[PDB]
Amino acid sequence: AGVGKTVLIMELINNVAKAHGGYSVFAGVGERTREGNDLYHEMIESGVINLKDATSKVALVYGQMNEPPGARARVALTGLTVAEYFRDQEGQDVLLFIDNIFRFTQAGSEVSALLGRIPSAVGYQPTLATDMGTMQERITTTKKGSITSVQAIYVPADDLTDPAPATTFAHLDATTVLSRAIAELGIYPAVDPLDSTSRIMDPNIVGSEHYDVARGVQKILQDYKSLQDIIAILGMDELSEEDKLTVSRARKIQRFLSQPFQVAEVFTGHLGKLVPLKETIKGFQQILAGEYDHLPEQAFYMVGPIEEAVAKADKLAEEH
Amino acid sequence: DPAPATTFAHLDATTVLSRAIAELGIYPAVDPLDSTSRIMDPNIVGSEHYDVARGVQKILQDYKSLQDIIAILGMDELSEEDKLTVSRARKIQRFLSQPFQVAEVFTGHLGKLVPLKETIKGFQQILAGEYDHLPEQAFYMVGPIEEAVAKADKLAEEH
Amino acid sequence: ATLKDITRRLKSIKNIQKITKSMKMVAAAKYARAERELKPARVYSDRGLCGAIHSSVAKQMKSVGDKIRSILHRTHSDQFLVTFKEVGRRPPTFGDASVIALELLNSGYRFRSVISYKTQEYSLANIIYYSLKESTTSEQSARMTAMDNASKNASEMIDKLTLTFNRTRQAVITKELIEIISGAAAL
Amino acid sequence: KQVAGTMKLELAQYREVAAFAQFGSDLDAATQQLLSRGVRLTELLKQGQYSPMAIEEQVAVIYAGVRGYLDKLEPSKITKFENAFLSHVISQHQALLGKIRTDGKISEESDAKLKEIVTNFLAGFEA
Amino acid sequence: SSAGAVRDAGGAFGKREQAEEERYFRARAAEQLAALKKHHE
Amino acid sequence: EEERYFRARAAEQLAALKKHHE
Amino acid sequence: GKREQAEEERYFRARAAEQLAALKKHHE
Ligand SMILES: [Cl-]
Ligand SMILES: [Cl-]
Question: What does the record say mutating residue 40 to K does (chain E)?
Fold first, then answer.
């Protein structure tokens, strides 16, 4: 909580529906029923669910804490089957959500325990890999369509070497780390640019221009966090012209990573933007080269494409 | 462990012993930051009993925090205020110790039996700062607060 | 080796890490004071934990500051006279520097950068003030970097002990569960 | 919300600094404010057992600490100040406490009225 | 994690800190016993 | 300092654009 | 620790150069 988790989920549902033309599915697996009530009405506020007319983009499938292990174990399958329809029949690019995936692993362990089986390491089921494998491999790209799943992970005891997350980690193609420290700086969405990674980040897959521009932003942000430690202990005098130039550019970069959403139009002002892939690469590439050094930091904060950052700077200049 | 842990619920007053306290030489090795009782209340035993008892538990807990600072620095680099807190804390640790009548052969010295208010007024004087001039060795294994001053006379004449 | 020993050891170094982090910023704060005062002073210790400055001073002497005496006492006691203490917490001033000059005539008788350092009445008061201002600036820069290394070396030990903790954590859960399964089997 | 929002933030600034206060000695006046408010706001969090306070009474004791009336007073006298201050407002100023319970918020008039009560009571605390 | 964790471990820093305190107060005991000589005599 | 330097730098760049569009 | 070695090996690699600098002079 406290990172815009549900706001990110609703936006991904909205954007995939708007751009790719595919519906979404949310599977409430073993979490709080209160949280279901919170999400249900938030989706009506944003408009991804619509009661008045058949224009809804989400199909909800809930089986929470209050229901027994057998129920909680196979909720993910119930939600998956709804997502499988839109892939197999209507040929859509489907967007599944499983919150939380640890509860699938827990409920699987609880059912395996009650059935009377000699448990594996750390009290988990003998059929840990197979239960995960039979579920995850259904979530794939077929020739008919695809199902892109966004699975929330609770790592028990902050231990990545624990069987529950480790077995899950084999199937993951990416991550999206939402930090509270980033959210406190005012940068929404609160995605950590450093800690968030993907398997497809490779020059062969995404392309030559994508990888280099992406690694360029990852370099300057790592250099920013390094040089910021020197500012705290020693001072601003220590940083040279080479150092102080990269710090000013990095602050513009991390502000350009922020974006106003269509979901948060009823929450607050600012019209929601959908930024294309080519517009994103073109935007960040020009900052690293150093084209928009003359423009201030405030213009990059909360905009769609790079064009709006130029337009906002002139509009903000009229004030003072 | 299940066996001692479950027993805590069944008790009104507790006396949690410690090896770390025992190995220093403090006997009885009673943990002052663990042993508790239900009657420890300002309404029950009086406000003078409660404030002094908690006052002993305050400095002994703060003494543990200073011990972490002393491990890297040492006693020399500490401030005047922090040095005195340790001095008063170490004297309180030793004054909590007492030789028993049952354990004459173990200790060597004759056993003691301190009254109620002698205990209350004894630790109250140490916290107030009335025995900063006396060394910590004088409070080790004695009865009332009077014997600590009486033992300091012998330690002075021997030295 | 055993889950209980790892927990006490991990908690021990975690505290040492935070305390060394605190001494880095305090040394850094005193360094900021030292650099401002040294700027006009160029034109004109007791507390340890500051690299190898006390030994570096002893290097040129054989071939002020009570810690210097600690090294030289057993080797050569009778030679150098005077001796002072309480030099480290508060930087030197004209009042404190003048007392050093008084115990010479009226008596019976260097900072390069943040990560490197090199080793009649009124005229003598100038040269002694120059040396102590160079000495005080050198030790705070060294204590900053020394305590910075102490925290970073502690952080590495915490990281590796966290892994050994979690490996031992899982094995204790696995082993103790096997005891119960073996017990139920034999009934 | 009006008082506890600022209170939680100042405690969220204190705990980070906390460790520096053990051996700070020479230190700037900006961060010294965090030590002053920090320790004094922690004394307000202390409370005797079997002694529950009303919502309108709780906001008054935080209003004193958050607006900087405890700063000039010594840390040892904070527990003494609260007991004295809480008795003063409950005995003589029922009109103010009742208004906070009715509104559920410190209004424009109640803020200036409460400002007057603390400033006067703080003046001539000890005897 | 908790306070006083160094001496609880009982390693190098734990035992050296216990020795460091014992060094200080033994020297201060001699100084304080010397004060009792003056007040008595 | 941290942000005080670049907050001051950001204010100057606003004044540059204000003078430029005149 | 990993950087426990970093500090210790840095000390003795420097002292190796100093001792070899004393050894080469005596060799002449
Ligand atoms: Cl349900
Ligand atoms: Cl169909």
Answer: Retains its inhibitory activity at pH 8.2 and does not form a homotetramer at high pH
